[PDB]
Structure formats: C-alpha cells, structure tokens
Write an enzyme that holds these catalytic residues in place. Structure first.
Site, PDB file in Angstrom:
ATOM      1  N   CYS A 105       0.818  -1.205   0.000  1.00 40.39           N
ATOM      2  CA  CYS A 105       0.000   0.000   0.000  1.00 40.39           C
ATOM      3  C   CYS A 105       0.853   1.257   0.000  1.00 40.39           C
ATOM      4  O   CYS A 105       1.891   1.310   0.643  1.00 40.39           O
ATOM      5  CB  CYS A 105      -0.912  -0.021   1.233  1.00 40.39           C
ATOM      6  SG  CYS A 105      -1.993   1.414   1.451  1.00 40.39           S
ATOM      7  N   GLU A 233      -6.368   1.360  -3.693  1.00 35.55           N
ATOM      8  CA  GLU A 233      -7.643   0.679  -3.460  1.00 35.55           C
ATOM      9  C   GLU A 233      -8.851   1.625  -3.411  1.00 35.55           C
ATOM     10  O   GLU A 233     -10.002   1.178  -3.376  1.00 35.55           O
ATOM     11  CB  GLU A 233      -7.593  -0.179  -2.197  1.00 35.55           C
ATOM     12  CG  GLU A 233      -7.324   0.581  -0.911  1.00 35.55           C
ATOM     13  CD  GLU A 233      -5.882   0.449  -0.446  1.00 35.55           C
ATOM     14  OE1 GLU A 233      -4.975   0.445  -1.314  1.00 35.55           O
ATOM     15  OE2 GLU A 233      -5.665   0.348   0.791  1.00 35.55           O
ATOM     16  N   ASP A 264       1.673  -5.713   4.225  1.00 32.39           N
ATOM     17  CA  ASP A 264       0.952  -6.578   5.139  1.00 32.39           C
ATOM     18  C   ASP A 264       1.424  -7.984   4.861  1.00 32.39           C
ATOM     19  O   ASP A 264       1.254  -8.506   3.760  1.00 32.39           O
ATOM     20  CB  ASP A 264      -0.548  -6.433   4.936  1.00 32.39           C
ATOM     21  CG  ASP A 264      -1.002  -4.985   5.028  1.00 32.39           C
ATOM     22  OD1 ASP A 264      -0.778  -4.347   6.081  1.00 32.39           O
ATOM     23  OD2 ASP A 264      -1.559  -4.465   4.035  1.00 32.39           O
TER      24      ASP A 264
END
EC number: 2.5.1.2
Length: 362
Positions: A105, A233, A264
């Site tokens: 991300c 996202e 993650d």
C-alpha cells in the site's frame, strides 16, 4: 484439527479474502478446519491461540523481538522468486524471513484525465504552487478546488511524519531506534501543515459517521476537489470513474525521494501446535491464486479492489482484464522502493506521538 486465522481488516472488502482463502484451502487441506477471528495488529499483539495472521509490517520488528513469531526457512517459501524483491527483504529480521508479503500500500496522487497542470507535479511543494491554500472549511470542498486527503486519526499523522522524515533526510531506515518527539523536524512539520493548508482543517480531519474509509474517493469522483491523495484501493470506490483518473507517486521532500510502501505480511505464531500446517496455510494466504481471486470481482456490479499485490504473477494476470493494474505494476516495479518498517518500541512511541503531533500542527 482447527486452525485459527485472521486476515487483514483494512481492505475494501474483507469477506472476499476470507472467501478466497477458505476456497483454496479446501482444495489442498479438506481435513483441516479454519476458524476466522477478529484481530487487528494496530491494537493488539497476537493472542496465544491465533495460529496464522496478517499484520502491518510496522509492527513486525516488535513481533519478532518479542518472540511471537516463527521464521520461514528458504525451504518454507513457495515461489519466492515470484515475490517482489523489496517486499521480501522488508519482511526480514535478524537475517530471517518472518512474514509472507500479501498486500502492499502507498499514497498516490489522483488527478482528472484532462488536468495536465496537476499531472506534472512531483512533490507536495510543486503541488502547493498549483492549488494553493484552501479557502473554505466546508465538507466537501467546492467543485474542482482544494486538495482531498485523509489526515484524520493520530496514527495516520504519526505514520506520515515518519514516512516524511525518511524522504527529508534522504536516508532509509527501519527505525530500530525511533526519533525523539522533542524537538520535531521542522522541514517535516512545515510539509505536513502545507498539506493541511491545501485541504483545510475540517475536511482533512473529517471522519465519516459510517466509518467509510474511502469516502473521499466518492467526493473526488462526484466532482469535489482539484486533486486527491489516497491509496490505490480507493479506485474501487470510484467504480466506473476509476477509468477517468490518472495517478502517480508524490515525494514529501524536494530532492531524492524514497518511495515507501506499507506491507501486510502473513505470519505464524511461535506458540502454534501445528507449525508445518500453519506454514502451509500462510503460503496459501499469500499465493498468487488466492490474492488474485480476492482482488477480482466475484458478483455482478463489483469492481476490483485495486490493492497492490506482492507477487509478479498477480499483476500479469489481472492486467489482461484491468489495464489499471498495468500502470500499478510500473509503480511497484521501480528500483528504489522500500517497505515501511518501525522499531520494537513502535507502540509506546505512537502513544506519545499522538499527544504531541496534533499540537505541533494545530
């Protein structure tokens, strides 16, 4: 036999990962039962009974040094050549791999198709020269004016400060030793406040009643604001408008930028009664098929989640049907990318940072 699992909750659609994971698991281990639990690495350390779980790599150091995890030998990683080199190294500590990268991300600068003046910006300063200070405190900003960015929550500001610090000093670090909360770096505060200026106090600090973490993507799409800085996202929320915007990485400094990505990783509890099975499940949760199936739309009227996967295969498969992932692949395939990591004392430092940062900003 029942394995307790926990997926990363901060995604557009959690149920889609769970559905994907359970589906693929059944194909390989129909005799083993999965029991999903609610667990957020952001609020708690892994409970003694949670076998496999996904965590934000900012807590990896702490998890490792606390003896909570089990490492993966080179023999325990499926298709390690498929994982993005930088993501795999960002998962190492003490020379060992302590997690399998599942999702990446980063913050992007979203701007509208025809708007070229904005598309040539490289850092927040050049960005300031184009949109200037936000005049109104109304939520949302007027049509085609101001900057949209989510700077609400003490942890978001604390994370942005640290990410900015690396860009300023021009030096990447895993922050084993966290910087002093006094005195704070001015070049960093100067930059965070500039963001708040282009966005406005109320709008940047606004938290939706429903907890919609992607509401600003809805505003941008509707016509609000001149530019939007958020996660990839966020494009899921844009629906059909996703094809109407452009995006690109933005530097927090004015010189050599170090592109940072939150990672993650899936990890295994050191207290598990089934280490080989758990190590197998972790591989399943991080495999290309699982992540591909979770990012793709399942029912009609669903859009891709637009999360950044950590394997090359996933990008190559998705980009056939979704051209956006072709652009996302270029972003993630840059040479200088690094995973955002923080030291073991991340929890107390965070706790203290929230009490001083809002003040330092206003």
């Amino acid at each position: 036999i029942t394995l307790k699992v926990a997926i990363y909750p901060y995604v557009p659609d959690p149920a889609r990962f769970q559905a994907a994971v359970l589906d693929q698991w059944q194909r390989q281990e129909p005799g083993v039962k999965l029991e999903f639990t609610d667990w957020d690495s952001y609020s708690a350390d892994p409970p003694d009974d949670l076998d496999v779980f996904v965590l934000d790599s900012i807590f990896l150091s702490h998890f490792v040094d606390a003896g909570y995890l089990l490492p993966f030998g080179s023999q325990d990683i499926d298709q390690a050549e498929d994982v993005l080199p930088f993501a795999l190294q960002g998962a190492k500590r003490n020379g060992e791999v302590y997690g399998l990268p599942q999702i990446l991300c980063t913050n992007l600068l979203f701007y509208r198709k025809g708007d070229l003046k904005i598309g040539q910006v490289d850092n927040i300063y050049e960005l300031y020269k184009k949109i200037g200070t936000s005049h109104s405190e109304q939520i949302p900003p007027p049509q085609n004016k101001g900057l949209l960015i989510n700077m609400a929550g003490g942890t978001t500001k604390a994370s942005m400060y640290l990410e900015a610090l690396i860009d300023v000093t021009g030096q990447y670090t895993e922050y084993d030793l966290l910087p002093p909360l006094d005195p704070l770096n001015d070049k960093v505060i100067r930059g965070l406040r500039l963001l708040i200026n282009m966005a406005g106090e109320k709008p940047s600090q606004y938290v939706p009643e429903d907890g919609d973490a992607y509401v600003r993507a809805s505003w941008f799409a509707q016509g609000s604001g001149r530019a939007f800085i958020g996660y990839s996202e966020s494009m899921m929320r844009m629906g059909d408008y996703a094809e109407q915007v452009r995006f690109k990485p933005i530097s927090s400094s004015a010189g050599q930028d170090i592109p940072l990505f939150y990672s993650d990783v899936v990890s295994v509890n050191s207290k598990t009664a089934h280490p080989e099975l758990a190590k197998k499940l972790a591989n399943v949760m991080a495999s290309a098929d699982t992540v591909e199936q979770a990012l793709r739309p399942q029912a009609d009227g669903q859009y891709p989640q637009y999360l950044l996967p950590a394997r090359h295969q996933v990008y190559e498969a998705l980009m056939q049907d979704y051209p956006i992932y072709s652009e996302l692949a270029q972003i993630v395939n840059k040479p200088s990318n690094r995973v955002f990591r923080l030291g073991p004392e991340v929890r107390t430092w965070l706790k203290d940072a929230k009490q001083v940062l809002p003040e330092a900003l206003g």
